[PDB]
Design a binder for these strands. Sequence first.
DNA 1: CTGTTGCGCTTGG
DNA 2: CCAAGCGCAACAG
Length: 258
Amino acid sequence: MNWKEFEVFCVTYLNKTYGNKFAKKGESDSTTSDILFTGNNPFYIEAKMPHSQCGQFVLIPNRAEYKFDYSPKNKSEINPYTQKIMQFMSENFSEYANLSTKGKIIPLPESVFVNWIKEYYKSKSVKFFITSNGDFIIFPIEHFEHYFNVSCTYRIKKSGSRHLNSKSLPDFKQALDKKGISYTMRGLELHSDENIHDKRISGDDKDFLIKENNGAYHVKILSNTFNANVIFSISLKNNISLFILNEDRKAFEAAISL
DNA sequence: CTGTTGCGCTTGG
DNA sequence: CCAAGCGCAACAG
Ligand SMILES: [Ca+2]
Ligand SMILES: [Ca+2]
């Protein structure tokens, strides 16, 4: 299953097991965490799949100063663990200056990465995580390191897409006719008898993507920003103790009972 | 209103 | 195992 379905399967599990007190926030909605417990003591729960990514922050390479700078447009403030990572990379600047989509892993200890994740998700009022290994496993944020192995890398991650708008349809129609294919466009609703799902066309300093949602096709404009962010990757540990899973399951049942 | 940018998400190969 | 970006919201121009 995908992550969208996985978040639903978690909250449908929580609602059936503990009552209808778990609201899911928007999918791809990033302003807050996934699941909101609407009890007397309300808190958030974050659903991760066994192989997930776990937060990021962009660093701008100051090639003139040979140091790395925190992007002022980041959405989380610098914590002592952010400055630790930045201090390492700027000590090894030239080895990290060659930005790449493949990225360079950061060989600092895993404890520092756990701490950054702990502080990032505490700022989001996350009290517990939920994930499955065949059955659902739930634990509070303070026991994170006992469930996930954390790697950290510095890689380019191209920014996301936007809807095609009124201004850029002329460039998109011109790029589609140069491709030589059926179509008819009513407004921005694109119709065609040929399957053009996930087709990518280019032109006029813009790359477009075509997707079907409601029987017809709509168009996305791909980004042009290619910045580099420190980003974390987590993997669920295979053999986990059972004294720990029950101890943190009861901490969860005690938290939704306040 | 347009377009950058950062953050969500594993996903694709 | 290794490489890599689109779907979102916030925000300056
Ligand atoms: Ca989320
Ligand atoms: Ca999540």
